[PDB]
Amino acid sequence: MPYWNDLDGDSQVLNDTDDLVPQKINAGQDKAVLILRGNAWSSHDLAATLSGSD
Amino acid sequence: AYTKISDVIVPELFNPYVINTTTQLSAFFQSGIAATDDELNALAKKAGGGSTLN
C-alpha cells in the first residue's frame, strides 16, 4: 500500500524583476506478511476403555 | 500426484492511496502575537501603500 508524504519547503521573497519556481511531491511504500500455522494430535482408545474415561 | 502450488499462478493486490502528514506539530499560538489594531489596518489595505508609517 502506498502513501503521499506532505509538501514542504522554504518560501521565496516575492519581488519584481524575478519569478518563482514550482516544487514537487513523492510517493511511498508499505508491506506486510501473511502467515499460517496449525497442528494435530491423536488420542488412544483401548486405554480409554480401560482407564475410566476418554 | 499433486497440483502442487508451484504450478498455479499467485496474483497480487493493491488498495488506493492514503495521505500521510509528516508533523512537527507547531503552534506557539495563542500568544503574542494576536488581536490586531486598526492602525496597522491603515498600514495594510490600499490606499496609501507602504512602507510603514511613523
From Swiss-Prot, chain B:
The gene is 13. It is found in: Virion. Interacts with the scaffolding protein gp11. Interacts with the decoration protein gp12. Capsid protein self-assembles, with the help of the scaffolding protein gp11, to form an icosahedral capsid with a T=7 symmetry, about 61 nm in diameter. The capsid encapsulates the genomic DNA. It comes from Bacillus phage SPP1. Belongs to the lambda phage major capsid protein family. This is Major capsid protein.
